[PDB]
Design a protein around this motif. Structure first.
Motif, PDB file in Angstrom:
ATOM      1  N   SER A   5     -32.138  62.144  60.348  1.00  9.46           N
ATOM      2  CA  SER A   5     -30.836  61.481  60.678  1.00  9.46           C
ATOM      3  C   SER A   5     -29.859  62.149  59.832  1.00  9.46           C
TER       4      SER A   5
ATOM      5  N   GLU B 184     -28.366  55.075  58.739  1.00  7.43           N
ATOM      6  CA  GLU B 184     -27.898  56.224  58.038  1.00  7.43           C
ATOM      7  C   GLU B 184     -27.612  57.482  58.965  1.00  7.43           C
TER       8      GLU B 184
ATOM      9  N   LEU C 156     -33.174  51.818  59.302  1.00  6.00           N
ATOM     10  CA  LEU C 156     -32.342  52.800  58.538  1.00  6.00           C
ATOM     11  C   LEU C 156     -32.066  54.051  59.108  1.00  6.00           C
ATOM     12  N   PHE C 157     -32.822  54.598  59.686  1.00  2.55           N
ATOM     13  CA  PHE C 157     -32.502  55.621  60.400  1.00  2.55           C
ATOM     14  C   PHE C 157     -31.170  55.736  61.401  1.00  2.55           C
TER      15      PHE C 157
ATOM     16  N   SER D 128     -31.542  55.317  50.153  1.00  2.00           N
ATOM     17  CA  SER D 128     -32.697  56.135  49.868  1.00  2.00           C
ATOM     18  C   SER D 128     -33.753  55.290  49.314  1.00  2.00           C
TER      19      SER D 128
ATOM     20  N   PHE E 111     -36.335  59.965  57.750  1.00  2.10           N
ATOM     21  CA  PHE E 111     -35.256  59.466  57.206  1.00  2.10           C
ATOM     22  C   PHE E 111     -34.167  60.657  56.929  1.00  2.10           C
ATOM     23  N   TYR E 112     -34.537  61.909  56.336  1.00  2.31           N
ATOM     24  CA  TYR E 112     -33.332  62.736  56.042  1.00  2.31           C
ATOM     25  C   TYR E 112     -33.214  63.675  57.432  1.00  2.31           C
TER      26      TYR E 112
ATOM     27  N   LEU F 160     -38.085  51.583  58.826  1.00  2.00           N
ATOM     28  CA  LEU F 160     -37.838  52.858  58.824  1.00  2.00           C
ATOM     29  C   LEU F 160     -36.910  53.264  60.265  1.00  2.00           C
TER      30      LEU F 160
ATOM     31  N   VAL G 217     -36.079  52.617  51.433  1.00  2.00           N
ATOM     32  CA  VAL G 217     -36.878  53.524  52.260  1.00  2.00           C
ATOM     33  C   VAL G 217     -38.138  53.682  51.661  1.00  2.00           C
TER      34      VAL G 217
ATOM     35  N   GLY H  76     -42.131  60.187  56.036  1.00  2.00           N
ATOM     36  CA  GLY H  76     -41.355  58.763  56.192  1.00  2.00           C
ATOM     37  C   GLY H  76     -39.782  59.130  55.327  1.00  2.00           C
ATOM     38  N   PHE H  77     -39.811  59.999  54.549  1.00  2.00           N
ATOM     39  CA  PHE H  77     -38.578  60.641  54.014  1.00  2.00           C
ATOM     40  C   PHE H  77     -38.223  61.779  54.855  1.00  2.00           C
TER      41      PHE H  77
END
Ligand SMILES: CC(C)[C@H](N)C(=O)OCCOCn1cnc2c(=O)[nH]c(N)nc21
Length: 488
Positions: free
Chosen positions: A157, A25, A21-22, A133, A154-155, A18, A136, A150-151
């Motif tokens: 970023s 993205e 990909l942070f 997405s 992610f969102y 994570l 993740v 965790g999402f």
């Protein structure tokens, strides 16, 4: 095993990947919402001012057509990761395509380099936005309760890129060096790619390296026939219209108009049918139809603050921010930063409003009605301001106050429609329901791609008062049926 190959920790208590990909993205959505925020001005600016000189209405219209296609293209790109490449491959392909499209706008290709850009980005976006997405979610094992925050991270970023890049990119608009800004985004995107190449192998392990439901020998032939032909028919009718001088953007803006109204219907038709949807899960699908309207009416107005509201403010207001003695020039690219800033601040705080209420929470249509009313009320605001002041240059304060009312409406409607997208999706057509809620954004954007042609005939001001009113009228209507929808 999928979870035995990857580290289960390493990034604020979540799986190390994570962290990878942070950073990916982030550097993508940074260069996207940066490009996205010059681009409007790179079109309808004058050639002496380094722009391109496109009709104000064709440029506003491209913007919503370009936008809708970003989100429709998630549908085949979710598919290509599902049947041919896998999630990882698609993301890598998507990323490399995107960087090509950014490089295109950097080169002095005028009208060619613009659309080749749109082509390369739209392609890679559907291979990347929905399949990044995916990866993740697949990092958390079956019964792992961390997946939720965790999402959220992610969102985060997503909104961090989209916040910082209009700020930075603002200078290349002032010194009217558009080429140089599209190169910054271009680099910024490569940063993300390099970082994935350098650290994706060891943190993501083996996740999504193979497709889930790969294509059989005969499916490779069937689908490669069908898809092959439509690509041909499309190419030809573009080729044909270019060399007969029939081709303008009304071809594209109407096609997408058609798709954007077609594609919601097919999904509800193939869904409501089929004996795989029990009587419980059906009718509930008939209960998302109203919500889909309220989500379409909402994103109509929200996604117009990226091509309509901000031009109006640049041309009709003093562009001088003025709060409790703090005055400074409000840069026009800086409008696209309010909307994420208030998300990053108040996404956690509208989270406590619903948690302190428990069961006396708003329903679900109640949220969707709240968030459409506001966006509705927000266009009534700015229309009325323009109607009061008329020719006299008013404060950009008012243009900001609209953006805020809107983003507050999204705080009820963005966290609910995606909680509810793949919440009560039919226990068979889950992805098919993911594709529904997302189209709330794609259909609004294909409707806007045509809706903006009403600006010239209705006048910039009255426009705003017409749209805000259909939102509130039609919202209040659906709010009378708001107990029937709630039965679900
Ligand atoms: C103008 C922009 C900054 C805009 N308000 C924004 O934040 O866009 C986010 C990009 O769309 C993808 N996305 C962001 N949050 C979500 C979300 O919560 N669910 C899904 N499926 N997609 C999301």
């Amino acid at each position: 095993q999928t979870i035995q190959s990857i580290p289960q920790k390493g990034f604020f208590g979540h799986p190390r990947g994570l962290g990878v990909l942070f950073f990916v993205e982030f550097w993508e959505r940074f260069s996207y919402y940066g490009m996205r925020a010059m681009l409007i001005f790179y079109m309808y600016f004058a050639i002496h001012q380094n722009g391109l000189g496109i009709d104000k209405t064709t440029a506003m219209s491209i913007m919503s057509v370009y936008g809708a296609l970003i989100y429709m293209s998630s549908i085949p790109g979710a598919w290509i990761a599902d049947r041919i490449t896998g999630t990882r491959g698609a993301t890598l392909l998507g990323a490399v395509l995107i960087i090509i499209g950014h490089i295109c706008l950097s080169l002095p290709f005028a009208l060619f380099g613009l659309f080749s850009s749109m082509f390369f980005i739209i392609i890679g976006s559907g291979l990347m936005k929905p399949n990044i997405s995916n990866i993740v979610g697949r990092l958390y094992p079956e019964n792992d309760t961390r997946i939720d925050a965790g999402f959220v991270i992610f969102y985060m970023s997503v909104n961090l890129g989209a916040l910082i890049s209009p700020i930075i990119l603002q200078h290349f608009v002032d010194i009217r060096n558009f080429h140089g800004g599209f190169l910054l985004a271009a680099i910024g995107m490569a940063l993300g790619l390099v970082w994935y190449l350098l650290f994706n192998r060891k943190n993501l392990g083996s996740v999504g390296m193979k497709p889930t439901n790969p294509l059989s020998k005969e499916e490779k032939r069937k689908y490669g026939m069908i898809i092959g032909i439509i690509v041909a028919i499309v190419i030809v009718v573009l080729l044909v219209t270019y060399y007969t001088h029939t081709l303008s953007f009304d071809l594209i803006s109407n096609t997408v108009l058609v798709l954007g109204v077609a594609l919601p219907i097919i999904y509800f038709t193939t869904m409501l049918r089929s004996k795989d949807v029990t009587d419980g899960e059906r009718s509930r699908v008939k209960a998302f139809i109203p919500l889909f309207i309220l989500g379409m009416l909402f994103w109509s107005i929200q996604e117009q603050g990226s091509n309509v509201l901000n031009i109006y403010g640049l041309e009709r207001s003093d562009m001088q921010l003025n709060l409790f003695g703090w005055t400074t020039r409000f840069g026009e690219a800086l409008f696209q930063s309010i909307n994420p800033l208030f998300i990053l601040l108040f996404a956690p705080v509208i989270s406590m409003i619903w948690l302190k209420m428990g069961k006396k929470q708003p329903s679900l249509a109640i949220k969707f009605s709240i968030g459409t009313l506001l966006a509705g009320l927000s266009y009534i605001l700015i229309g009325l301001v323009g109607l009061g002041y008329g020719h006299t240059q008013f404060s950009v304060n008012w243009v900001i106050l609209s953006y805020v009312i809107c983003v507050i409406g999204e705080l009820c409607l963005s966290p609910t429609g995606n909680s509810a997208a793949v919440k009560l999706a039919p226990k068979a057509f889950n992805a098919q329901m993911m594709s529904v809620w997302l189209l709330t954004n794609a259909s609004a954007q294909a409707i806007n791609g045509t809706l903006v042609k009403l600006i010239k005939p209705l006048g910039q001001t009255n426009y705003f008062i017409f749209l805000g009113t259909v939102a509130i009228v039609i919202t209040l209507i659906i709010l009378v049926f708001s107990p029937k929808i709630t039965k679900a």
